[PDB]
Amino acid sequence: SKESPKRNSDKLIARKKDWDPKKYGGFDSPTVAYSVLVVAKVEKGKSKKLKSVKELLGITIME
DNA sequence: ATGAGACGCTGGCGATTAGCTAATCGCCAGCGTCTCATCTTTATGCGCC
């Protein structure tokens, strides 16, 4: 990713293993190696219904 | 009787900027009368090809 503080976002990447980016701050903007087309089901709404969905998954270089 | 051909950070964020059905339930439903006549039809009661 890009090499450049703590924030309440999920885009932050843990700088070390146990170092939580929500309490320590971390990395940002991961470079997607290649996108993966997936098709399955996730929960949706307050009733958590499993609806069939298809979308593009972002596989970064680290991943 | 020499002087053209070879052209940028973008993607990955935030952060504006913009905009929309849908699922749940409740409420709450114009209505009041009379007159007048009019016809039916039903319950019971009575008769043999």
Swiss-Prot record:
Coiled coil: none
Domain of life: Bacteria
Phenotype upon gene inactivation: Loss of correct processing of pre-crRNA and tracrRNA. Loss of immunity against a plasmid with homology to CRISPR spacer sequences.
Use in biotech settings: Coexpression of Cas9 with an artificial single guide RNA (sgRNA) which fuses the crRNA with the tracrRNA in human cells has shown it is possible to target and modify DNA sequences of interest. Cas9 plus the 2 sgRNAs have also been expressed individually in human and mouse cells to achieve DNA targeting; cleavage efficiencies of the artificial sgRNA were lower that those for systems with the 2 sgRNAs expressed separately. Microinjection of Cas9-encoding mRNA and a synthetic sgRNA into zebrafish embryos induces targeted mutations.
Resulting phenotype, G25C: Probably inactivates protein
Quaternary data: Monomer. Binds crRNA and tracrRNA.
Family: Belongs to the CRISPR-associated protein Cas9 family. Subtype II-A subfamily.
Main function: CRISPR (clustered regularly interspaced short palindromic repeat) is an adaptive immune system that provides protection against mobile genetic elements (viruses, transposable elements and conjugative plasmids). CRISPR clusters contain spacers, sequences complementary to antecedent mobile elements, and target invading nucleic acids. CRISPR clusters are transcribed and processed into CRISPR RNA (crRNA). In type II CRISPR systems correct processing of pre-crRNA requires a trans-encoded small RNA (tracrRNA), endogenous ribonuclease 3 (rnc) and this protein.
Free-text domain note: Has 2 endonuclease domains. The discontinuous RuvC-like domain (approximately residues 1-62, 718-765 and 925-1102) recognizes and cleaves the target DNA noncomplementary to crRNA while the HNH nuclease domain (residues 810-872) cleaves the target DNA complementary to crRNA. Has a bilobed architecture with a recognition lobe (REC, residues 60-718) and a discontinuous nuclease lobe (NUC, residues 1-59 and 719-1368). The crRNA-target DNA lies in a channel between the 2 lobes. Binding of sgRNA induces large conformational changes further enhanced by target DNA binding. REC recognizes and binds differing regions of an artificial sgRNA in a sequence-independent manner. Deletions of parts of this lobe abolish nuclease activity.
Stated name of the protein: CRISPR-associated endonuclease Cas9/Csn1
Name of encoding gene: cas9
Full-protein interval shown: 1106 to 1170 of 1368
